[PDB]
Design a protein around this ligand. Structure first.
Ligand SMILES: *[C@H](C)[C@H]1/C(=C/c2[nH]c(/C=C3N=C(/C=C4\NC(=O)C(CC)=C4C)C(C)=C\3CCC(=O)O)c(CCC(=O)O)c2C)NC(=O)[C@@H]1C
Ligand SMILES: *[C@H](C)[C@H]1/C(=C/c2[nH]c(/C=C3N=C(/C=C4\NC(=O)C(CC)=C4C)C(C)=C\3CCC(=O)O)c(CCC(=O)O)c2C)NC(=O)[C@@H]1C
Ligand SMILES: *[C@H](C)[C@H]1/C(=C/c2[nH]c(/C=C3N=C(/C=C4\NC(=O)C(CC)=C4C)C(C)=C\3CCC(=O)O)c(CCC(=O)O)c2C)NC(=O)[C@@H]1C
Ligand SMILES: *[C@H](C)[C@H]1/C(=C/c2[nH]c(/C=C3N=C(/C=C4\NC(=O)C(CC)=C4C)C(C)=C\3CCC(=O)O)c(CCC(=O)O)c2C)NC(=O)[C@@H]1C
Ligand SMILES: *[C@H](C)[C@H]1/C(=C/c2[nH]c(/C=C3N=C(/C=C4\NC(=O)C(CC)=C4C)C(C)=C\3CCC(=O)O)c(CCC(=O)O)c2C)NC(=O)[C@@H]1C
Ligand SMILES: *[C@H](C)[C@H]1/C(=C/c2[nH]c(/C=C3N=C(/C=C4\NC(=O)C(CC)=C4C)C(C)=C\3CCC(=O)O)c(CCC(=O)O)c2C)NC(=O)[C@@H]1C
Ligand SMILES: *[C@H](C)[C@H]1/C(=C/c2[nH]c(/C=C3N=C(/C=C4\NC(=O)C(CC)=C4C)C(C)=C\3CCC(=O)O)c(CCC(=O)O)c2C)NC(=O)[C@@H]1C
Ligand SMILES: *[C@H](C)[C@H]1/C(=C/c2[nH]c(/C=C3N=C(/C=C4\NC(=O)C(CC)=C4C)C(C)=C\3CCC(=O)O)c(CCC(=O)O)c2C)NC(=O)[C@@H]1C
Ligand SMILES: *[C@H](C)[C@H]1/C(=C/c2[nH]c(/C=C3N=C(/C=C4\NC(=O)C(CC)=C4C)C(C)=C\3CCC(=O)O)c(CCC(=O)O)c2C)NC(=O)[C@@H]1C
Lengths: 160, 169, 36, 50, 67, 161, 160, 161, 160, 161, 161, 160
C-alpha cells in the first residue's frame, strides 16, 4: 500500500515520513471509499467479465482451444479461466491497496518464466489481460474505469 | 533529476529571489498542464510496447540495412538490444513529459550516449530517426485520443534528437 | 614440424566484398530501372 | 604478501566472505596500495571497483 | 576486540528479477561490535530472520579495553 | 513491512477469496482512523527528540543504571541507549502509521532480545524506558492516539521480554 | 518535488510510472492551487513574518542578542534576520514544490556544521524558525496554516 | 550557433528527409515571433549603453564591489565589467534573434566560469548585475519581449551557477 | 594504552613487535613511574581541583547557573560537579594508561550525543575542562603539568 | 608517504650508498626539531576547529562567495568548504610532523586542481583561505613552528595553483 | 584486548572510584616487570622459528600424527600445524607483554576448541606440543620470563581442554 | 619510521595523531643518538663485517661455493658478498630509522620470489645474515649489540 511505500522510504532514509508522503497518505485515505466501490463492483460482477474475456480471447486467438494449442483439456480450460479469476482478484487487491505492490508480489514478478515453465505463450496471456481489462472498463463507469485502467495497463506492461 | 517546478525553484534560488509573479505564472501553467501530462503518460504506458514495436517496424523499413548483413541489429540479440534502447527512450520520454523538464532526460539518457554508442559501433543517426518515429506515433495516437493538449509531447523527443544528433550544420 | 606455422607462415588471405547499395536505395534502383 | 591470520578464519568459516573483504580492505596491505597513494576521491573510486 | 557470533538467514528479494546465481542465505558470522548495528539493521531491512546472536568475544559490561 | 490495510488483502489472498464485509469493515475503520494516525505520526516526528529526553529523564536519569556499575554508565553506552530509544520511537511511529505491529515484529524484534541477553542489557530497565516513552507520547499526542501507540509499545515490551 | 520523487522511484525499478505514483502526481497537481496560495501569502508577508518572528525570538532569548551572544550587535542582528529570511524563502520553495527536498538541498545539509563553525546556537535557530511558523500560521486559514506547519516542523527537526 | 530555423533544418538533415508539416509549423511560428524579436532587438541596440548604465546603478554602484578592495574598483576593471555587461546584452540579443541558446553555449558560457574564477571575478555580483540588466531590459521592452530576453539572461545566469 | 595499541598494530600486521615498537614499550614502562606520580597527585588533590574548576567555570559563564540554564539549582550543581569529577578521573586513567584510549572509550565517545540529549552546553563543558586543566597545571609540577596538558587538550578538543 | 628519515634513507639507497656524515647531520637536525614538531602538532590538534573557524571568518565570510550565486551559498557547499579547510590543516600538520611534503603531494594535490576545475571551485579564493589558516596557525603556535606549518600550507597553495 | 593497566582501570571504573594503592601496587608491579617482559618478547621474536622447530621435533615429529593417517600427514596439514603453533607463540608473547590473558581469550580461544573438535586435530597432542613449546621458551628466555610465558601457555592449554 | 606509521594510521582513521602517538614520537626522537651511533659503528665496520661473515658462512656451508652451488664461481661469490652488503646496508637503514619498514620496503618484499627465481637458497641467505649479526654483535657493546641484533633477527626470520 501507499502507507507501506511511504514508511519503507522513510526507513530507507532513516527518517520519519515527510509532509508530501503524509499528504499522499491522506489522499489515499480519502479515496479509500472509491477503492471499496471498485472492489465491490469487480468482485460481484467478475463472472460476466471473465466469461466475456475468455470468449473474446479464444475468438481472437483460435489456437489454444484449436489443434496444436494449449487448452485442449477441460482441465486446461478451467485452469485458464481460474487464471483469469485470480488475476482479476489480484487487480481488485491492488486497486484497494492503491499501488501496484500487491499485484507485483502476488502474480507479477517472475510471471514470464512462470508461464514459460508451463508453455503458456506470454503474448497470449498479455492479450488475455488486455481483453479482460477491456471488459472490466466497459462494464465499469467512466471515472471508475479511468481509475481502474492504469493498474491493468501496468500488468500488461509487465507481461509484455 | 529536476522537473519544471524544481528547475524554476533552482533558477530563482540562484539569484536568491522570492517567487515572483512570473514564477507563479509558470507554476500555474505547469500545474494546469499536469492533467494532460498525466493523461499522455497513462496513454503511453497503455500502448508502450506496441509503440516501440511499431517504431522499429517502421525504422527497419526506412533504413533496411540494420537487419541485413553488416547492420547493427543483425542478430536477434542485436535486435532485442535495439528494441531495449527504444523502450528506454520511450520510458524516459514519458518521465520527462510528466516532469515537464528535460533534465531528467539528460541526466539519465544523453550525457554519454555518443560515447557508449561509438564504443559499441552503433550508428547515431538511425537511432534518432527511430526516436522521431516514436514521437510521431505517440503524437498521432494522442491526437486520435481525447487529449486536449498534446504540444508538450514533441519537446522531450525533439530535445533527445537535438542532443544526441550530430551537428550537421 | 612446420605444420605449426599459422601466424608465422604465409598469411591466408581472405576475400572482402566491396560495399554495394542495399534496400536503402530501392527507390533509386527502381529509378535506374525505369531510366534503363 | 598475504594475511594468513585472516586466511585461516575465512578457510574454517569463522568470518565469511563479506567480513573477509571488510577486514582485508581496511588492512594495512590495502591501505598502502590503494588509499595511501591516492587522493580521497580517487581512493573512493578505486574502492568501489574493489 | 569484542565481536558477535550471529546466525542468520537472509533470503534474496531480487534473485528472480536479476537472474543471478543462488547463495546459501543461512550463515554464521563473526561481526565486529562497531559494525553489528549496521549489519543487523541491513539484515532486518533485507527481510531475513536472524536466528541466533551472541557476544563471542569480549566480557559483558566492560568499561575500558573495548579494542 | 506488512501494513494493516495490506493485512486483509494478504489474508484474502491466503484463503484465495475476495475481501468481504467482515474484513472491509476493518478496512473502512482503518480508512477512518488514517487521519488521526497521520496527525499522530506528524506530531511525533516533529517532537521526536523531546519525547526521548523526557522519557529518559523520567525513567533512567539519576538511577543505578546511569550510575557507575550500570549498563548505561559510560558515555558510549549512554549514547547507545539513547539511539536504541530513538529507534524504538521511530519504529513505534511507523507501526502506528501503518496500523499493525508486523513491522515491529520484523524490523525490531528479529534478534533484539537475544542481542540484549548477550550484551547484558537490563530487560527491566528497557521495559521501564519504553513505559516512560509510552507515557510521554500519550501525553504529547492525546489519549485517543496515545492508547493506540501504547498498544504497539506494549507489543514491543512483550517481544523484548 | 513529489513528481521528482515518484519519477525517481519508478526509474529505480526501471518501469513506467505506477498507477499509485500517477495518482500521487495528480493529487499534487490538484493541490497546486492551494500550494501557490500559501506560498504567495508567505512571500507577500515575508517582511512582517520575519520582523515579528525576530521580535519574538529576541524577546524569548535575550542571551543571543545580549553582549556575548552570537547575534549581539546591529550587524549580527541583521545577519540573524537575513538567515530567517533565507529560511522563509526555503519554506516558500518547499510549499511550491509540495515537499522538503529544496529545503534540505539548499539550507538543511551541513547546517549543523555551518552554524557550529559560525558559533550559533542551533536550538536558537530552531526557535526562530518555530516563531516564524507561529507568525505565518496566524496569517492564514486553519488548513493552510497546518499545511505550512509541515515545512516549518521539518526545518525545526533538521535544526534540532 | 544555431537559430530556430537552423535547428529545424539540422533536425531534418540529420534524418535525411525533407521539411514536412511539422518543420513548416515551427518555421512559421518562428517567423510570426520574428517581428517582435526584431523590434526588441532594434530597441535594445538603440538603447544599449543606457541599459548597462541602469543595471550598474541598480546593482553594483555604491557597493563594496566598487569600493576599494572590490573587483570592480580600479577603472580598468570597471571598464571590463561594463564591457562584460555589453557582451551579455549583445549575446542575449543574438539569442533572442535566433530563438536559441546555442550561441550562449558556444561563445558566452564557454569557459566563462573558470575564466572568472582565475580572474577573481565575483560570480554572485555578476549574477545580480545580469539580473538587473534583465529587469531593466524587461522594463524598456515590455512584458512579452522582456520575458523573452529574460529567458536568455537567466540562461547565462544559470550557466554561471 | 600504548602497549595494547602496539599489540593491536602488530596483530593486524600479523607479526611480532618490531624493535622500534619494543623500544617504545620499554620507554613507556620506564615513564610509568612519572605517570603514576601524576595520577597520585591528581587523585590526592581531586576535591580542590574540581572545586576551583567549577568556581572558575561559574564565574566565566554565569548563564549556566542563571535561571533557565541547565545547571540551575543545588541538584544541578551537584550533577555538574559529579561530571567534573568523572572527567578528572578519566584524565587520571588516561595519564596512567599513557594514551587517551580509556578516556575516549569511557567518557569521550558519544559525549556530544549525550549532552545534546541532556541539553547541556558542550562549549560550557569544554570550558570547564579547560579550567580544570589550568588549575591542575598550577597545582602540579611543570613537567607533569605539561604531560597532562596533552590529555586535557585532547579531551577539550574532542568536546569542542 | 615519506618523512625526513625515510626521505634521506631513500636518497642514499637510490644511489646505493650507506649513510654518510651529511645524511646523519640531516637526521640530527630532524631529531632536534622533533620536539617542536610534536608540540605544534598537539597545539593544532587541540585548536583544529578554531583555526578553520577563524580563517573562514577572516577571509571568506560576508564576501561574494557566501552570497547567492557564490560557490559557498548552500549549506552543503559551506560544509564542503569547511571540510576542505579541515583537510588542508590536518595534512599540513601531517607534513609538518613528517618533515617532508610528500603526503601532501600524494594525498592532497595530485588531481585536486582537476577536481576543483570540474566543480568550479575558486582556486584563488581557496588560496586566500589557506593563507588565512596559515596566519591563524602561526599566531597560535609561534614563529618557529608557524613558519614550518606555513611552508607546507604554501606548498598546498602552489600545488593548487 | 586489556593489558594490565587497562584491566586495572576497568576494575576501578566498575566501582567508579579513583586509582588507589590497592591497584597502584599492581600498576607498579607491571611497570617493574615491563623491562623483563620486553626482553623476553625480544628473545621470542628473535628465535620464534627456532623455538617452534625445536618443540615440534621434541614433541610431534616421528609420531603417529606425522605418520600417514594422522592429523599431520599432508604437507598442507603440517604447514597448518606450524601456523597454529607460531600463532600460539606470538599471541602468548602478546599476552605476556600486555600482562593479561584477555588477548589470548579473545583472539586465540574464541572458538579454537570447537574448531579443533570439528576438524579432528588431536587436542591432547596439541597439549603436549604446547608443553614442549613452553619448555623450550622457558629454557631459552630465562626462569622468570620462562614462568611468565608459561602462565599464558598453560592458560591456552586449559582453554583448549 | 614510527612517525610515518603513526601518520599513516591517523590518516587512515581520518584524524589527528593522538597524544599516545605524539608522546611515542617524542620518545623516539629523543632516543635517536644511540641509534645513530650504532649506525656509524656498523657503517664503519661494513667491510670487515661483510668479509668475516662471508668467510664464516662459506666455512659453515661448503655447498654454496662448491661446484653446482649458487655462489660457485668468481662472479657468483662476489655477487653473494654484494647481497650481504645490501642487507647490511638495509639493516643500518632500519637501525637509524628505529623501525623495520625501510628494510621491508627496500629489500624484504618479494625476497623469497626473487631468490627462488635466482636459484639461491634463502636459508643460506638467512645464515649469512646470522653470521653478519654475530660479527656485528662482536664489534658492538652488549646493549648496542642486542639492539642491532633485533633488526638482524627480524631480517633473518623474514628470510626464513
Ligand atoms: C516465417 C514463416 C519466416 C520468417 C519471416 C519473417 N521474419 C521477419 C523478421 C525477422 N527475421 C529475422 C531473422 C533472424 N534473426 C536472427 O538472428 C537469425 C539467425 C539465425 C535469423 C534467421 C530478423 C532479424 C527479423 C527482424 C527484422 C526484419 O524485419 O527482418 C518478419 C517480419 C516481422 C515483422 O514485420 O515484424 C517475417 C515475416 N522468419 C522465419 O524464421 C520463417 C522462415
Ligand atoms: C536501436 C534503435 C538501435 C540499436 C541498438 C543497440 N544498442 C546496443 C547496445 C547498447 N545500447 C545502450 C544504450 C543505453 N543504455 C542506457 O542505459 C541508456 C539510457 C537508459 C541507453 C540509451 C547501451 C548502454 C548498450 C550496451 C550495454 C547494454 O545493452 O546493456 C546494441 C548492441 C550492439 C551489439 O552488437 O551488441 C544495439 C544493437 N542498433 C541499431 O541498429 C538501431 C539503430
Ligand atoms: C598443530 C599443533 C596440530 C595440527 C594442526 C592443524 N590445524 C589445521 C587447520 C586449522 N587450524 C586452525 C586454527 C587457527 N586458525 C587461526 O587463525 C587461529 C587463531 C588466530 C587458529 C587457532 C584453523 C582455523 C584451521 C582450518 C584451516 C585453516 O587454514 O584455517 C590442520 C589441517 C586441517 C584440515 O582439515 O586440513 C592441521 C593439521 N595438526 C596436528 O596434528 C597438531 C596437533
Ligand atoms: C521448491 C522445490 C520448494 C520451494 C522453494 C523455495 N525456495 C525459496 C527460497 C530460497 N531457495 C534458495 C535456494 C538455494 N539456497 C542454496 O544455498 C542453494 C545452493 C547454493 C540453493 C539452490 C535460496 C537461496 C532461497 C532464498 C531466496 C534467494 O533466492 O536467495 C522460496 C521462497 C520462500 C519465501 O517465501 O521467501 C521457495 C518458495 N518451495 C516449495 O514449496 C517447494 C517444496
Ligand atoms: C558540568 C561541568 C556541566 C553540567 C552538568 C550536568 N550533568 C547533568 C546530568 C548528567 N551528566 C551525565 C554525564 C555522564 N555520566 C557518566 O557516567 C559519564 C562518564 C563517566 C558522563 C559524562 C549524565 C549521564 C547525566 C544524567 C543524570 C545522571 O547521571 O543520572 C546535569 C543535569 C541536567 C538536567 O537537566 O537534569 C547537569 C546540570 N551542566 C552544565 O551546564 C555544565 C557544562
Ligand atoms: C536504553 C533504553 C537501554 C540500553 C541500551 C544499550 N544498547 C546498547 C547496544 C546496542 N543496542 C542495539 C540495538 C538495536 N539494534 C538494532 O538494529 C535495533 C532496532 C532499532 C535495536 C533495538 C545494538 C545492535 C547494540 C550494539 C551497538 C554496537 O555498536 O554494536 C548498549 C551498549 C552495550 C555495550 O556493551 O556497550 C546500551 C547501553 N541500556 C540500558 O541500560 C537501557 C535499558
Ligand atoms: C568630479 C570631479 C566629477 C564627477 C564625479 C562623479 N563620480 C561618480 C561616480 C563614480 N566615480 C567613480 C570613479 C572611480 N572609482 C575608482 O575606484 C577610481 C579609480 C581609482 C575612479 C576614478 C566610480 C567607480 C563611480 C561609481 C559610483 C561608485 O563610486 O560607487 C559620480 C556619481 C555618478 C552617479 O550618477 O552615480 C560623480 C558625480 N562628476 C562630475 O561631473 C565631475 C567632473
Ligand atoms: C538568527 C535566527 C540566528 C543567528 C544568525 C546568524 N548567522 C550569521 C552568519 C551566517 N549565516 C549564514 C547562513 C546561511 N547562508 C546561506 O546561504 C544559507 C542557506 C541559504 C544559510 C543557512 C552564513 C553563511 C553566515 C556567514 C556570514 C555570511 O552570511 O556571509 C551570523 C553572524 C555570525 C558572525 O559572527 O559573523 C548570525 C548572528 N544568530 C543567532 O544567534 C540566531 C540563532
Ligand atoms: C630426502 C630426499 C631429503 C631429506 C629428508 C628428511 N625428511 C625428514 C623428516 C620429515 N620429512 C617429512 C615429510 C613428509 N611427511 C609426510 O607425511 C609428507 C607428506 C607428503 C611429507 C613431505 C616429515 C613430516 C618429517 C618429520 C619426521 C617424521 O616423518 O615423522 C628428515 C629428518 C629430519 C630430522 O631432523 O630428523 C630427513 C633427513 N633430507 C634431505 O637432506 C633430503 C633433501
Amino acid at each position: 500500500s501507499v502507507v507501506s511505500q511511504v514508511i519503507l522510504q522513510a526507513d530507507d532514509q532513516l527518517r520519519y515520513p515527510t509532509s508530501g508522503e503524509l499528504k499522499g497518505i491522506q489522499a489515499f485515505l480519502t479515496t479509500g471509499a472509491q477503492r471499496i466501490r471498485i472492489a465491490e463492483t469487480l468482485a460481484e460482477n467478475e463472472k460476466k467479465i471473465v466469461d466475456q474475456a475468455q470468449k473474446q480471447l479464444f475468438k481472437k486467438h483460435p489456437e489454444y482451444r484449436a489443434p496444436g494449442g494449449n487448452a485442449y483439456g477441460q482441465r486446461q480450460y478451467n485452469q485458464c479461466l481460474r487464471d483469469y479469476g485470480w488475476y482479476l482478484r489480484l487487480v481488485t487487491y491492488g486497486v484497494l491497496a492503491g499501488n501496484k505492490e500487491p499485484i507485483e508480489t502476488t502474480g507479477l514478478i517472475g510471471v514470464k518464466e512462470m508461464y514459460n515453465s508451463l508453455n503458456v505463450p506470454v503474448p497470449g496471456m498479455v492479450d488475455a489481460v488486455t481483453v479482460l481489462k477491456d471488459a472490466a472498463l466497459g462494464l465499469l463507469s467512466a471515472e471508475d474505469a479511468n481509475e481502474t485502467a492504469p493498474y491493468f495497463d501496468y500488468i500488461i506492461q509487465f507481461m509484455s | 533529476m529536476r522537473d519544471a517546478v524544481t528547475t524554476l525553484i533552482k533558477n530563482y534560488d540562484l539569484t536568491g529571489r522570492y517567487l515572483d509573479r512570473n514564477a507563479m505564472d509558470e507554476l500555474k501553467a505547469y500545474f494546469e498542464s499536469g492533467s494532460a501530462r498525466i493523461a499522455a503518460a497513462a496513454m503511453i504506458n497503455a500502448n508502450s510496447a506496441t509503440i516501440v514495436k511499431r517504431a522499429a517496424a517502421q525504422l527497419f523499413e526506412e533504413i533496411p540495412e540494420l537487419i541485413r548483413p553488416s547492420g547493427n541489429a543483425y542478430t536477434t540479440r542485436r535486435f532485442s538490444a535495439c528494441l531495449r534502447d527504444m523502450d528506454y527512450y520511450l520510458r524516459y520520454a514519458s518521465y520527462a513529459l510528466i516532469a515537464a523538464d528535460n533534465n531528467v532526460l539528460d541526466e539519465r539518457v544523453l550525457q554519454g550516449l555518443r560515447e557508449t554508442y561509438n564504443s559499441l559501433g552503433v550508428p547515431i543517426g538511425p537511432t534518432v530517426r527511430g526516436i522521431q518515429i516514436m514521437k510521431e506515433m505517440i503524437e498521432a495516437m494522442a491526437e486520435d485520443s481525447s487529449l486536449n493538449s498534446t504540444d508538450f509531447i514533441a519537446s522531450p523527443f525533439d530535445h533527445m534528437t537535438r542532443e544526441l544528433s550530430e551537428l550537421s550544420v | 614440424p612446420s605444420q605449426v606455422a599459422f601466424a608465422s607462415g604465409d598469411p591466408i588471405p581472405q576475400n572482402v566484398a566491396r560495399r554495394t547499395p542495399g534496400p536503402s536505395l530501392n527507390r533509386f534502383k527502381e529509378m535506374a530501372r525505369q531510366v534503363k | 604478501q598475504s594475511i594468513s591470520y585472516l586466511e585461516s578464519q575465512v578457510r574454517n568459516g569463522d568470518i565469511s566472505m563479506k567480513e573477509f573483504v571488510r577486514r582485508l580492505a581496511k588492512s594495512p596491505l590495502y591501505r598502502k596500495q590503494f588509499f595511501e597513494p591516492f587522493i580521497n576521491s580517487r581512493a573512493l573510486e578505486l574502492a568501489f571497483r574493489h | 576486540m569484542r565481536m558477535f557470533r550471529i546466525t542468520a538467514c537472509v533470503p534474496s528479494q531480487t534473485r528472480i528479477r536479476t537472474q543471478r546465481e543462488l547463495q546459501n542465505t543461512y550463515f554464521t558470522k563473526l561481526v565486529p561490535y562497531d559494525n553489528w548495528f549496521r549489519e543487523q539493521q541491513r539484515i532486518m531491512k533485507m527481510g531475513g530472520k536472524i536466528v541466533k546472536v551472541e557476544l563471542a568475544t569480549g566480557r559483558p559490561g566492560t568499561n575500558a579495553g573495548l579494542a | 513491512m506488512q501494513d494493516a490495510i495490506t493485512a486483509v488483502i494478504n489474508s484474502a489472498d491466503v484463503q484465495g477469496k475476495y475481501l468481504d464485509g467482515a474484513a472491509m469493515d476493518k478496512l473502512k475503520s482503518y480508512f477512518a482512523s488514517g487521519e488521526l494516525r497521520v496527525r499522530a505520526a506528524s506530531v511525533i516526528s516533529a517532537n521526536a527528540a523531546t519525547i526521548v529526553k523526557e522519557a529518559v529523564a523520567k525513567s533512567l536519569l539519576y538511577s543505578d543504571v546511569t550510575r557507575p556499575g550500570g549498563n548505561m554508565y559510560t558515555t558510549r553506552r549512554y549514547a547507545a541507549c539513547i539511539r536504541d530509544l530513538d529507534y524504538y520511537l521511530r519504529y513505534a511511529t511507523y507501526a502506528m502509521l501503518a496500523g499493525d505491529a508486523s513491522i515491529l515484529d520484523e524490523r525490531v524484534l528479529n534478534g533484539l532480545k537475544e542481542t540484549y541477553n548477550s550484551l547484558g542489557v537490563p530487560i527491566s530497565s528497557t521495559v521501564q524506558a519504553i513505559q516512560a516513552i509510552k507515557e510521554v507520547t500519550a501525553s504529547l499526542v492525546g489519549a485517543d492516539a496515545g492508547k493506540e501507540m501504547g498498544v504497539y509499545l506494549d507489543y514491543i515490551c512483550s517481544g523484548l521480554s | 518535488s513529489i513528481v521528482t520523487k515518484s519519477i525517481v522511484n519508478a526509474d529505480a525499478e526501471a518501469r513506467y510510472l505506477s498507477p499509485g505514483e500517477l495518482d500521487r502526481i495528480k493529487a499534487f497537481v490538484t493541490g497546486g492551487a492551494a500550494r501557490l496560495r500559501i506560498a504567495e501569502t508567505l512571500t507577500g508577508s515575508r517582511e512582517t513574518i520575519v520582523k515579528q518572528a525576530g521580535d519574538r525570538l529576541f524577546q524569548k532569548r535575550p542571551d543571543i542578542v545580549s553582549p556575548g551572544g552570537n547575534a549581539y550587535g546591529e550587524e549580527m542582528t541583521a545577519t540573524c534576520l537575513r538567515d530567517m529570511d533565507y529560511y522563509l524563502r526555503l519554506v516558500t520553495y518547499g510549499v511550491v514544490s509540495g515537499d522538503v527536498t529544496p529545503i534540505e538541498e539548499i539550507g538543511l545539509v551541513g547546517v549543523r556544521e555551518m552554524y557550529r563553525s559560525l558559533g550559533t546556537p542551533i536550538e536558537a535557530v530552531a526557535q526562530s524558525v518555530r516563531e516564524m511558523k507561529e507568525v505565518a500560521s496566524g496569517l492564514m486559514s486553519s488548513d493552510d496554516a497546518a499545511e505550512a506547519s509541515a515545512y516549518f516542523d521539518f526545518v525545526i527537526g533538521k535544526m534540532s
